[PDB]
């Protein structure tokens, strides 16, 4: 019964290879979304600035990298801050959430909705234009 | 036809699964090198930002804090009490590298 067991030991290895392939495909697609959202943001701001003939005021703009804490408008926040600004302490009387900049970018639509399998024709046009030619297959796939 | 010999078929299939794996591994280092070369570099120096309007619309009707802190900075949240205790929530920020910037967006 040699042959039978060696068939098992190759289906084991194959299953192991297959799921490591699934993980790296997901990780790769996440990297591709980050590339699209970032280049998309840099271009939108580039054209915006070369229309206003000027870069936005120092405020009114949040530069990457950042994270966002959001809470209801009626939440009471109080804060302590150290002098050097190396330590902050915030109290909230209601729940909050925290989001990384990349997921804010996805919510803005900068990943062209690919993060949701939903993509316009004018969205996959630009999404595919923002990646190297060889990874356009992935982008078309993530738009179902 | 040749009885069994799923071996040569399974062995051949495992060969291609290696080709698929190192193709993905190679595509990742592509996107990674591609990512850093558009970020770190200087004609995109001042173009990596979102506006007040961008952020407010992702979280319509929320008070908003934008934290700008060195990476690895500790962000600590106490696990809350259950009901029958006062449900208070808290964020503790402590950096070692440099100061932290917190922007009230609202």
- Print the domain residue range for B92: 1-106
Q: What resolution in angstrom units was achieved for this structure?
A: 2.3
Cβ-defined contact of A70 to B25 (cutoff 8 Å): no
The residue ranges of DSSP E strands in chain A, in sequence order, are 61-63, 67-72, 77-81, 87-92, 96-100
- On chain B, the residues whose CB falls within 8 A of the CB of A39 are 38
Method: X-ray
Domain range annotation of chain A: 1-144
Number of domains making up chain B: 1
CB B55 within 8 A of CB B70: no
CA A77 from centre of chain: 28
Query: What's the full length of chain A, in residues?
Result: 144
Q: Nearest chain A Cα to B71, which residue?
A: A65
| Residue B87 host element (H or E) | none
Q: CA neighbours within 13 Å on the CB side: how many for A50?
A: 7
Q: What's A56's DSSP letter? A: P
- Report which of A90, A92, A139 is spatially closest to residue A119, judged by C-alpha positions: A139
Tokens 């402590």 correspond to B94
Partners of A69 in beta bridges: A98, B65
What tokens does A74 get?
């009626």
Which of A9, A88, A89, A97 is best to mutate for the B interface (most B CBs within 10 A)?
A88
The phi and psi torsions of B105 (rounded to 5 degrees) equal -100, -50
Residue A127 CA to residue A39 CA, distance in Å, equals 10
CATH architecture of A1-144: Up-down Bundle (1.20)
Residue B4's contacts (CB-CB under 8 Å, 6 or more residues apart) are A3, A7
Cβ-defined contact of A73 to B61 (cutoff 8 Å): yes
CB B99 within 8 A of CB B70: no
Tokens 């194959």 correspond to A14
The phi and psi torsions of A97 (rounded to 5 degrees) equal -125, 160
Taking each helix axis from N to C terminus, what angle separates B6-39 and A2-52, rounded to the nearest 10 degrees? 20
């Amino acid at each position: 019964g040699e042959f039978a067991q060696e068939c098992q030991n190759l289906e084991v290895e194959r299953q192991r290879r297959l799921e490591r392939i699934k993980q790296k495909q997901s990780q790769l697609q996440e990297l591709i979304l980050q590339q699209i959202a970032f280049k998309n943001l840099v271009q939108r701001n580039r054209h915006a600035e070369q229309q206003a003939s000027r870069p936005p005021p120092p405020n009114s703009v949040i530069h990457l990298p950042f994270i966002i804490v959001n809470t209801s408008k009626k939440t009471v926040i109080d804060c302590s801050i150290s002098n050097d600004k190396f330590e902050y302490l915030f109290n909230f009387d209601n729940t909050f959430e925290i989001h990384d900049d990349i997921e804010v970018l996805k919510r803005m639509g900068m990943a062209c909705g690919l993060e949701s399998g939903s993509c316009s024709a004018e969205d996959l046009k630009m999404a595919r234009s923002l990646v190297p030619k060889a990874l356009e297959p992935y982008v078309t796939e993530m738009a179902q | 036809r040749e009885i069994a010999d799923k071996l040569i078929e399974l062995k051949a299939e495992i060969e291609e699964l290696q080709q698929r794996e190192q193709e993905l591994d190679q595509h990742k280092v592509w996107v990674q090198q591609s990512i850093r070369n558009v970020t770190e570099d200087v004609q995109n120096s001042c173009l990596a930002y979102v506006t007040h309007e961008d952020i407010c619309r992702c979280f319509a009707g929320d008070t908003l804090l934008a934290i700008r802190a060195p990476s690895g900075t500790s962000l600590e949240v106490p696990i809350p009490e259950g009901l029958n205790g006062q449900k208070k929530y808290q964020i503790h920020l402590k950096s070692v590298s440099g100061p932290i910037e917190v922007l009230l967006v609202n």
